[PDB]
Every structure is written in C-alpha cells, then in structure tokens.
Structure 1
Amino acid sequence: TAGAAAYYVGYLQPRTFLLKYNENGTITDAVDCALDPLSETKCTLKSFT
C-alpha cells in the first residue's frame, strides 16, 4: 500500500513564444503567439503593449 497521492500531466506542442528578461536575467513574462488574435498581434509588433 502507498497511501494517497496525485499529479498533473500535460503534453507539449511546438510553439513560438516571446520572452521578457528582467534586469536580473529572469524570464518574468512570456507571450504565446497562437493563443488568440491579441497575443499574435503582440508577437508581430515585438512588444507586450
């Protein structure tokens, strides 16, 4: 017997993201280009606003 436990699983896909590096070299924010029209617009301009 092994008591109780749980875990989550997801499967990866080939995507192109846009990453924001903090002043301390940390990936604080990311944008996925194929999620929705707004995100793809953000990717095309190469800006988060």
Structure 2
Amino acid sequence: HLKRRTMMFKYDENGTIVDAIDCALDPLSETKCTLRSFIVEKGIYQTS
C-alpha cells in the first residue's frame, strides 16, 4: 500500500532512474534528503 511520502530519485545520464532514497526511513536518509546528494561527507548536518 502506497503512503504519503517524500522521495529523492537519482536520474541517469541516459534518463533512467538508478537510485532512490525514502526520506522518512532513517536519520541517514533524512540527512541525504536535507541535502540533494546520495553521498554525504564526514560532518554533522542539521536535518529538516
């Protein structure tokens, strides 16, 4: 069953979707969703 969620999708250079993040899953996904990147560097980030 689909629920009201916010997701971030990574689009390939050919146009396809290659990765996804459910922003409500864990604090790491919330950190990734606060920025716009699938790769987070070392540090402390304030999250929405």
TM-score of the aligned structures, taking structure 1 as reference length: 0.75
1:32 maps to 2:22: yes
The alignment's C-alpha RMSD in Å is: 0.5
- The answer for the alignment partner of 1:20 in structure 2 is 10
Report deviation, 1:30.
Answer: 0.6
- The answer for the alignment partner of 1:42 in structure 2 is 32
Question: Identity of paired residues, percent?
Answer: 72
Larger Rg: 1
Report deviation, 1:45.
Answer: 1.1
The 2-side partners of 1:45 and 1:21 are apart by 16
The 1-side partners of 2:19 and 2:38 are apart by 9
Task: Report SS of the residue matched to 1:13.
Answer: coil
The count of aligned residue pairs is 39
